[PDB]
Amino acid sequence: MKTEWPELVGKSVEEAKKVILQDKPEAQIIVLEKQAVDNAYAEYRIDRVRLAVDKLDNIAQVPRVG
């Protein structure tokens, strides 16, 4: 299944979540902005997907599992 969603970029976050669940049904779909991940916590999350959205809760960038 998928762990990256380049297809969602330019789409709605809730739909993105639907897709992400389609791919990874059990996914912990989280939200932040673009590919701006600096200030993070421990090792990868094949459980979670963070969502990089814009001011219009759309997918600004490729949201990824971990």
UniProtKB/Swiss-Prot annotation:
One of the protein's GO biological processes: response to wounding
Membrane-spanning parts: none
Top-rank lineage group of the source organism: Eukaryota
Keyword Signal in record: no
GO molecular function: serine-type endopeptidase inhibitor activity
Keywords assigned: Protease inhibitor, Serine protease inhibitor
Known role: Inhibits both subtilisin and chymotrypsin.
Family recorded in the similarity comment: Belongs to the protease inhibitor I13 (potato type I serine protease inhibitor) family.
Name by which UniProt lists this protein: Subtilisin-chymotrypsin inhibitor-2A
Annotated source species: Hordeum vulgare (Barley)
